[PDB]
Amino acid sequence: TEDATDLQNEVDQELLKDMYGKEHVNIVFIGHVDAGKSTLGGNILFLTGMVDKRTMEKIEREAKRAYFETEHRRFSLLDAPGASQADIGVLVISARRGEFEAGFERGGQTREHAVLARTQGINHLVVVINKMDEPSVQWSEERYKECVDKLSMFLRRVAGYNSKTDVKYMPVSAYTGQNVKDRVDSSVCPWYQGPSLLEYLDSMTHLERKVNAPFIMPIASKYKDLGTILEGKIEAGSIKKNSNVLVMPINQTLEVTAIYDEADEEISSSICGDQVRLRVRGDDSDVQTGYVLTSTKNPVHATTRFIAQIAILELPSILTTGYSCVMHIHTAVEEVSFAKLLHKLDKTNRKSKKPPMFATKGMKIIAELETQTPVCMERFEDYQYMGRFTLRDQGTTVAVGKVVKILD
Ligand SMILES: Nc1nc2c(ncn2[C@@H]2O[C@H](COP(=O)(O)OP(=O)(O)O)[C@@H](O)[C@H]2O)c(=O)[nH]1
Secondary structure (H helix, E strand, C coil): CECCCCCHHHCCCCCCCCCCCCEEEEEEEEECCCCCHHHHHHHHHHHCCCCCHHHHHHHHHHHCCCEEECCCEEEEEECCCCCCCCCEEEEEEECCCCHHHHCCCCCCCHHHHHHHHHHCCCCCEEEEEECCCCCCCCCCHHHHHHHHHHHHHHHHHHHCCCCCCCCEEEECECCCCECCCCCCCCCCCCCCCCCCHHHHHHHCCCCHHHHCCCCEEECCEEEECCCEEEEEECCECEECCCCEEEEECCCEEEEEEEEECCCCCEECCEECCCEEEEEEECCCCCCCECEEEECCCCCCEEEEEEEEEEEECCCCCCCCCCCEEEEECCCCCEEEEEEEEEEECCCCCCCCCCCCCCCCCCCEEEEEEEEEEEEEECCCCCCHHHHEEEEEECCEEEEEEEEEEECC
16 A cells, blocks of 8 residues: 655665756845845855855955755855746845844835745745844844844735744854854854754755646555545645645546645645645546646656666666666656667766667666656656656666656
């Protein structure tokens, strides 16, 4: 009834590189006159190894396509006023006395900023309470609570943000870097419990473009309860309740009726990133794990022929085409066969001028694969986990790869 590992057999040797790039995210930074935007930005580029001290200092004085990286993502900074939409919107608010307060008055532009965000499609606003080090504020839990509560009422009032479930507040010092890359030390701020800014940014689940994409949730387990329970990780989009999903590749319709979190509570909705357990009405006689629950308008793709970069780990090593094993792309489990060894690879992913007649261990290649049955997938590029597979020679492992192109 269930799936042990969602090709989490991808463990062993960190060669997961060049072929499994980091997640491309689009972040924008919003804030007042001297809120700290430029310093915050610069310090992140430096603290995160993108730039040197001089460059840092250069950038910051001249602000008066860049990008940074965390463990699992690459963030591309966008201007203030497809890859045009922000995934994340960071409002930078100064915690200094006089500056903070200035914002919420005739002169100040904070209400404008909340509306700007809203217009830009930011429904999960990240609010950074900057300058917690500045003498007028020295990491006082009271100053922090003062700012956060004013912002709570304010943002709900002028732009509808519900601070309990929409806005994430965070204290930082853009100048000293405290709570930017690394959490603030207890000796400096005994009270803060959460993560640093980049920690949150690296793990944070609500990415606008992805939340707004079509729904995709590979079925990881089918089992009974008050009826059938399809369940897995939502990989894109969002799911409501008493709303119809499509089952691919079979193209059969169904209706969600309950959503249960990892603590089995009947919620009304979840988004991408969440690990949920659904329940549905409809003929699920042909439904099985591996298949993908998706939007009825732009459903996930399914094909039988596609292209893909691969890397052999330890197979007996030989012959082009043919070779049949067991692919795993997200929970599907499917007999796949080589069908046109097109290019080889090496060191600095070049390509290949002499299409091999076969492959071997320690040889990464690209080739047209084939399945008798169609399997749901997408380009890693577009939906990483929907294009991340591992091959398996009848028991043992063999290779691992990503899909690059869908062939009709
Ligand atoms: N005390 C202190 N000063 C800061 C901090 N962050 C920014 N500032 C100062 O506040 C001013 C804001 O300018 P900037 O950092 O460029 O913010 P921007 O004008 O929005 O780009 C600068 O003079 C910074 O030195 C901080 O965390 N602590």
